[PDB]
Amino acid sequence: QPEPDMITIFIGTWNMGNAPPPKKITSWFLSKGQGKTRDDSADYIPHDIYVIGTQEDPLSEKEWLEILKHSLQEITSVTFKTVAIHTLWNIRIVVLAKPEHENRISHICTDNVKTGIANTLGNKGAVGVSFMFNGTSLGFVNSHLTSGSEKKLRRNQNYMNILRFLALGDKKLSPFNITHRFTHLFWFGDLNYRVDLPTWEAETIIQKIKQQQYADLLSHDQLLTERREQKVFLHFEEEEITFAPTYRFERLTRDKYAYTKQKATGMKYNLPSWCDRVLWKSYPLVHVVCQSYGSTSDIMTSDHSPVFATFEAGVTSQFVSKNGPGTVDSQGQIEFLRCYATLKTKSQTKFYLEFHSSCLESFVKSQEGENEEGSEGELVVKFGETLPKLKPIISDPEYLLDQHILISIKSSDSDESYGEGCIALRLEATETQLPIYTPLTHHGELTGHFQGEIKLQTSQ
Ligand SMILES: CN1CCN(C(=O)Nc2ccc(F)cc2)CC1
């Protein structure tokens, strides 16, 4: 039975509005409704992994697991295995997998982050799950961010707290936050970004939605504008939105948006918005293709509609050679040549690098680089040809060309990371000096760049 080189992943996000679901929710798992929808001919084909994020979820874990598993069984005739379930307050993530994947899945981690302080602590935050699928690390974050049209900056702060403090994946990757720990990271939820138009334009907005004319609304979507100004979700992707705003509906129909201020809303307007979103970030040159992104039309218990997204994701096998794991394979080497970091910092410490990769027995620390001034005010840290030659555990190009090297640049004075990035080993050539590049971030914000050349030796 061959190991897969591709899987499909279902991501669902639904703010349930503290109401039990209706008896049938199969349309959600089938990616049927509005937007980019799944072909009818696929309906019986199970996804490999289903990741369900809920917010304002009133059900027990048991109650929801029963509804989810019976739903999928009705669709596919497959009894899914529960990989993980984690709940913070009324924010929940469930991961289900086909039974054939049970002995492909390991290193299951769960965590949560509570956002805000005192007043603003006690209902918003995030839950997450990570695991290994054979040789591929997968991370999943379900976040319910701060509500309200005038709180986009709070949402951005919530995002940074979640990616700083959510403890998923390999704890040995100590300089790296969740935005660098996974081959594929999916981040979804009620992100609560709104369409930033005047309140007086509510009926105009509804008109546009009824005509399926989303362009002038999307140009005011706070998540798209904030992402374009690099305020949030730097280096994440989102499929094009081709479905109606998923909030705020009158319950038990989808024919009415309930946008007017009410005591129950704290006298806030809720103009129709795309609150409910799915974003991802995969390591460079790994296959990831969005195959659906849309909302259901027929699930109306909540003031939100469910959102679905599906993906093809490249995966690798758990590689064994005569040599590694358990030793290095002397036919393999990675050389980083003529590299330099360009940093936005004003600090005047020396810097060293750390190289982290599951193709190494353990992480590798460099010597200190040489600091110079850039022409436009910047710090440039030069490493020359001084960098340690990296010794991978397996030399086979079928393994090594699929790997990645995480880079941290750290202060000699404090050992703290000033920037993190990732380099793919999916090169155009081996035994050939080739340009490499990664932006560097810290707490998910741009802090600089790393560039240079690489020369990769494999057993071929
Ligand atoms: C800490 N433990 C280790 C064993 N364990 C597990 O193996 N779960 C699993 C479930 C479903 C699946 F598909 C694969 C693995 C539960 C957590």
Swiss-Prot record:
Cellular compartment(s): Cytoplasm; Cell membrane; Membrane raft; Cytoplasm, Cytoskeleton
Keyword Repeat: yes
One GO cellular component term noted in the UniProt record for this chain: cytoskeleton
Expression sites by tissue: Specifically expressed in immune and hematopoietic cells. Expressed in bone marrow and blood cells. Levels vary considerably within this compartment. Present in at least 74% of immature CD34+ cells, whereas within the more mature population of CD33+ cells, it is present in only 10% of cells. Present in the majority of T-cells, while it is present in a minority of B-cells (at protein level).
Main location: cytoplasm
GO biological process terms, semicolon-separated: apoptotic process; determination of adult lifespan; immunoglobulin mediated immune response; intracellular signal transduction; negative regulation of B cell proliferation; negative regulation of bone resorption; negative regulation of interleukin-6 production; negative regulation of monocyte differentiation
UniProt keywords, alphabetically: Apoptosis, Cell membrane, Cytoplasm, Cytoskeleton, Hydrolase, Immunity, Lipid metabolism, Membrane, Phosphoprotein, Repeat, SH2 domain, SH3-binding
Superkingdom: Eukaryota
Post-translational modification: Tyrosine phosphorylated by the members of the SRC family after exposure to a diverse array of extracellular stimuli such as cytokines, growth factors, antibodies, chemokines, integrin ligands and hypertonic and oxidative stress. Phosphorylated upon IgG receptor FCGR2B-binding.
GO terms, molecular function: inositol-1,3,4,5-tetrakisphosphate 5-phosphatase activity; inositol-polyphosphate 5-phosphatase activity; phosphatidylinositol-3,4,5-trisphosphate 3-phosphatase activity; phosphatidylinositol-3,4,5-trisphosphate 5-phosphatase activity; phosphatidylinositol-4,5-bisphosphate 5-phosphatase activity; SH3 domain binding
Consequence recorded when altering V288E: In one patient with acute myeloid leukemya; somatic mutation
Job of this protein: Phosphatidylinositol (PtdIns) phosphatase that specifically hydrolyzes the 5-phosphate of phosphatidylinositol-3,4,5-trisphosphate (PtdIns(3,4,5)P3) to produce PtdIns(3,4)P2, thereby negatively regulating the PI3K (phosphoinositide 3-kinase) pathways. Able also to hydrolyzes the 5-phosphate of phosphatidylinositol-4,5-bisphosphate (PtdIns(4,5)P3) and inositol 1,3,4,5-tetrakisphosphate. Acts as a negative regulator of B-cell antigen receptor signaling.
Family: Belongs to the inositol 1,4,5-trisphosphate 5-phosphatase family.
Subunit-structure text: Interacts with tyrosine phosphorylated form of SHC1. Interacts with tyrosine phosphorylated form of DOK1. Interacts with tyrosine phosphorylated form of DOK3. Interacts with tyrosine phosphorylated form of SLAMF1/CD150. Interacts with PTPN11 in response to IL-3. Interacts with receptor EPOR. Interacts with receptors MS4A2/FCER1B and FCER1G. Interacts with receptors FCGR2B and FCGR3. Interacts with receptor FCGR2A, leading to regulate gene expression during the phagocytic process. Interacts with GRB2. Interacts with PLCG1. Interacts with tyrosine kinases SRC and TEC. Interacts with c-Met/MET.
Comment text on domains: The SH2 domain interacts with tyrosine phosphorylated forms of proteins such as SHC1 or PTPN11/SHP-2. It competes with that of GRB2 for binding to phosphorylated SHC1 to inhibit the Ras pathway. It is also required for tyrosine phosphorylation.
Protein name (record): Phosphatidylinositol 3,4,5-trisphosphate 5-phosphatase 1
Organism this protein belongs to: Homo sapiens (Human)
Taxonomic lineage from the root: Eukaryota, Metazoa, Chordata, Craniata, Vertebrata
This protein's encoding gene: INPP5D
Complete-protein stretch covered: 398 to 857 of 1189
